[PDB]
Amino acid sequence: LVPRGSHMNRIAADVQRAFENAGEKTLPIKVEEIVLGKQAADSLLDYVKRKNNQHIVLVCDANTHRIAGIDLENRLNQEGFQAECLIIPENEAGDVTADERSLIHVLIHTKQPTDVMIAVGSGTIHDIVRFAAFQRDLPFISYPTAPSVDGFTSAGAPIILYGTKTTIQTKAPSALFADLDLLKAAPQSMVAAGFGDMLGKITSLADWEISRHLAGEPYSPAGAKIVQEALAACIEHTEDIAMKTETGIRVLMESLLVSGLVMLALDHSRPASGGEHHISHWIEMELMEKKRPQILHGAKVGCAAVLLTDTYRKLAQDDGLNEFSPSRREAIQSAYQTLPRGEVLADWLRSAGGPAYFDEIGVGQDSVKNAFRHAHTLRDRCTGLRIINENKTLI
Numbered sequence: 146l147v148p149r150g151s152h153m154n155r156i157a158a159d160v161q162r163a164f165e166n167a168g169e170k171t172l173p174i175k176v177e178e179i180v181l182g183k184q185a186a187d188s189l190l191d192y193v194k195r196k197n198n199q200h201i202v203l204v205c206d207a208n209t210h211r212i213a214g215i216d217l218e219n220r221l222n223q224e225g226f227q228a229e230c231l232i233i234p235e236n237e238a239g240d241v242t243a244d245e246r247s248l249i250h251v252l253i254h255t256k257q258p259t260d261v262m263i264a265v266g267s268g269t270i271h272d273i274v275r276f277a278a279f280q281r282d283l284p285f286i287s288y289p290t291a292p293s294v295d296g297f298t299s300a301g302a303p304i305i306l307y308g309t310k311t312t313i314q315t316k317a318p319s320a321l322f323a324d325l326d327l328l329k330a331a332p333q334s335m336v337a338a339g340f341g342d343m344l345g346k347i348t349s350l351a352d353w354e355i356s357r358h359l360a361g362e363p364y365s366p367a368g369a370k371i372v373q374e375a376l377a378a379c380i381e382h383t384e385d386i387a388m389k390t391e392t393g394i395r396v397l398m399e400s401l402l403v404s405g406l407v408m409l410a411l412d413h414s415r416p417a418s419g420g421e422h423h424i425s426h427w428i429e430m431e432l433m434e435k436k437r438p439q440i441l442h443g444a445k446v447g448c449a450a451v452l453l454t455d456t457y458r459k460l461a462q463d464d465g466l467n468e469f470s471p472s473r474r475e476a477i478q479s480a481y482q483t484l485p486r487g488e489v490l491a492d493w494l495r496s497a498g499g500p501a502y503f504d505e506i507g508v509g510q511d512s513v514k515n516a517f518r519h520a521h522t523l524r525d526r527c528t529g530l531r532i533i534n535e536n537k538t539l540i
């Protein structure tokens with residue numbers, strides 16, 4: 146079907162191979178190339194050549210312009226492309242959001258000649274481009290400047306509108322090119338945010354087993370084992386990631402990309418996003434509400450899992466579980482018994498170079514106990530968190 150599929154996308158190729166070997170139906174992956182390595186601009190150029198692009202837009206911001214945009218744009222010009230590094234400017238609080246304002250700012254400075262968009266940056270840039278390109282019916286290329294998240298390959302765009310952050314569903318990148326040396330160069334906080342977002346998968350996978358057994362939610366064995374593999378390697382390499390060695394950031398980014406790839410293949414976020422992510426969503430809402438600057442997704446995710454792993458460990462051994470069926474008792478128990486302690490999570494997060502507790506990034510206890518009680522209400526997901534907050538005897 147595509148040799149570029151089974152050639153310039155060994156990651157996605159092998160993910161699909163796994164799902165197929167466990168006899169599972171999945172949506173075909175619609176990312177044609179995922180390159181992760183040295184250069185990557187070489188292969189980017191090869192791809193735009195192959196697809197006969199010409200008028201290329203590179204959506205960048207203050208920072209990503211500097212550390213990626215100019216390099217890429219100049220090399221594109223030298224090869225004979227109409228390239229341009231278009232900038233997204235900051236809001237009053239020095240933040241670059243996926244708000245309607247930034248969306249429309251991108252969606253006018255891109256002119257009708259333009260036949261391809263390129264997200265040069267991180268999750269937010271990637272959302273604005275993911276959305277904008279979809280509404281202007283153009284392919285967009287993933288150029289990540291940090292291994293901070295698993296939502297580069299995603300179809301959905303968490304954009305802000307009216308007065309809330311909501312996830313419109315759109316279309317995935319046409320390709321992805323990750324410069325391993327640009328990633329190594331990234332702030333340790335961002336690398337550690339990637340590690341954070343991956344540590345969320347300690348509790349997300351379990352909440353997915355709860356979801357599976359209890360609420361009869363879509364579940365994939367092969368998927369669960371894929372994200373297990375990924376999570377396992379990230380941990381193993383916790384030191385390599387800390388120091389930001391080649392192996393370490395390679396393993397981080399490959400694991401995050403595999404997370405987004407399963408999410409894509411299965412058409413929902415359940416294996417990657419559990420109670421820790423829901424809490425994280427609630428905190429984020431509170432930070433917008435307080436009118437104060439946003440903090441890294443992944444940082445919040447690590448800080449959330451560090452607590453919610455203990456919450457679930459306690460639930461699993463609560464006498465309240467005797468009100469419940471033998472089936473639901475043994476489901477919660479068996480799903481959560483293998484959870485490590487909050488302290489171990491925090492220890493990994495520390496070693497990695499990221500924050501363990503929300504006071505470190507300045508959330509505070511107020512919004513923690515607030516989020517912990519209401520987060521379950523954010524999305525129709527049977528989590529440990531819902532089992533708690535919808536049961537007197539566990540409240």
Ligand SMILES: NC(=O)C1=CN([C@@H]2O[C@H](COP(=O)(O)OP(=O)(O)OC[C@H]3O[C@@H](n4cnc5c(N)ncnc54)[C@H](O)[C@@H]3O)[C@@H](O)[C@H]2O)C=CC1
Nearest residue numbers: 208267268269272290291293294296299301303331441442
């Ligand atoms: N499934 C999905 O669609 C997912 C969505 N997200 C999105 O991700 C956002 C947060 O992701 P973040 O990684 O925090 O992105 P971000 O762009 O919001 O924050 C990264 C910050 O670091 C800067 N930066 C990026 N690369 C850099 C580099 N190489 N060197 C120096 N500075 C650099 C950026 O300019 C920005 O100020 C959320 O707001 C959400 O919209 C997050 C995960 C998954």
Ligand code: NI
Nearest residue numbers: 295342422446
């Ligand atoms: Ni996440």
